[PDB]
Design an enzyme around this catalytic site. Structure first.
Site, PDB file in Angstrom:
ATOM      1  N   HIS A  92     -15.253   1.833   9.662  1.00 27.54           N
ATOM      2  CA  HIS A  92     -15.175   1.278   8.296  1.00 27.54           C
ATOM      3  C   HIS A  92     -14.647   2.291   7.315  1.00 27.54           C
ATOM      4  CE1 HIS A  92     -17.293  -2.117   9.887  1.00 27.54           C
ATOM      5  NE2 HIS A  92     -18.444  -1.466  10.025  1.00 27.54           N
ATOM      6  N   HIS A 142      -5.224  -2.637   2.221  1.00 30.08           N
ATOM      7  CA  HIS A 142      -5.860  -3.280   1.070  1.00 30.08           C
ATOM      8  C   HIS A 142      -5.151  -4.519   0.541  1.00 30.08           C
ATOM      9  CE1 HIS A 142      -9.640  -1.282   0.191  1.00 30.08           C
ATOM     10  NE2 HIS A 142      -9.082  -0.136   0.566  1.00 30.08           N
ATOM     11  N   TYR A 174       7.040  13.565  16.333  1.00 25.10           N
ATOM     12  CA  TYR A 174       7.127  12.330  17.128  1.00 25.10           C
ATOM     13  C   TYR A 174       6.313  11.212  16.558  1.00 25.10           C
ATOM     14  CZ  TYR A 174       8.338  16.031  20.549  1.00 25.10           C
ATOM     15  OH  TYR A 174       8.869  17.177  21.179  1.00 25.10           O
ATOM     16  N   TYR A 224     -15.596  -9.667  16.793  1.00 26.25           N
ATOM     17  CA  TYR A 224     -15.579  -9.179  15.433  1.00 26.25           C
ATOM     18  C   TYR A 224     -14.118  -9.112  14.913  1.00 26.25           C
ATOM     19  CZ  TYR A 224     -15.705  -5.802  11.642  1.00 26.25           C
ATOM     20  OH  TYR A 224     -15.560  -5.081  10.445  1.00 26.25           O
ATOM     21  N   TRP A 244     -10.892   0.308  -6.043  1.00 22.45           N
ATOM     22  CA  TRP A 244     -11.146   0.796  -4.663  1.00 22.45           C
ATOM     23  C   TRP A 244     -10.894   2.259  -4.577  1.00 22.45           C
ATOM     24  CZ3 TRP A 244     -13.927  -1.124  -0.875  1.00 22.45           C
ATOM     25  CH2 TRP A 244     -14.201  -2.499  -0.870  1.00 22.45           C
TER      26      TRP A 244
END
Ligand SMILES: [Ca+2]
Ligand SMILES: [Ca+2]
Ligand SMILES: [Ca+2]
Length: 181
Positions: free
Chosen positions: A161, A8, A176, A124, A78
């Site tokens: 998304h 963000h 790991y 994209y 958000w």
């Protein structure tokens, strides 16, 4: 949640057109439209559909036209959106991000076959400002391509998304750091 916060922060910086460390809906929608039209070759019809959906998506995070938002308020916005939308998604309902992703999908699907090829994905990823090797681009494609069909469907791109914008850091670590010997 350092990884979600980091994605963000990088995106806030990417859409903060004047680089002043405060952001408006005007900046966010301006930069997104600019990319779909000029990097991804959206038609006018495509660009308007994307504009309406991206406006509703970013608006859902609390951003408004004519108003500058500082980081604390931006990120809290958000958080709130993500929490509400993940509830809707959990109930198999339509979300703002799905509507956005649908309008975007049509634009990145250059050959209109309803699936994103690797080449389409490369374009994209470049549009979102990412610079990376072929190998790295192929790895994130393989990660997106859950059924390993070789192309990305609408559901795969929705999950993509959702993972980027909304999904918080895993609660626990893996042995790991999640690598396999
Ligand atoms: Ca700004
Ligand atoms: Ca395609
Ligand atoms: Ca697939």
């Amino acid at each position: 949640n350092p990884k979600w916060i980091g994605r963000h922060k990088h995106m806030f910086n990417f859409l903060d057109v004047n680089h002043n460390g405060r952001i408006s809906l005007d900046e966010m929608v301006y930069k997104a439209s600019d990319i779909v039209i000029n990097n991804l070759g959206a038609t006018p019809e495509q660009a308007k559909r994307h504009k309406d959906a991206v406006e509703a998506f970013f608006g859902g995070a609390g951003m408004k036209y004519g108003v500058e938002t500082e980081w604390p308020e931006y990120i809290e916005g958000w958080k709130r959106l993500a929490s509400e939308e993940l509830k809707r998604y959990s109930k198999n309902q339509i979300t703002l991000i799905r509507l956005w992703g649908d309008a975007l999908f049509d634009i990145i699907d250059k050959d209109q076959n309803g699936a994103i090829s690797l080449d389409e994905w490369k374009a994209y990823t470049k549009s979102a400002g990412i610079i990376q090797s072929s190998e790295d681009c192929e790895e994130t494609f393989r990660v997106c391509d859950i059924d390993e069909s070789g192309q990305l469907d609408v559901d795969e791109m929705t999950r993509q998304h959702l993972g980027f914008w909304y999904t918080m850091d895993p609660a626990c670590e893996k042995l790991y750091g999640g690598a396999v010997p």
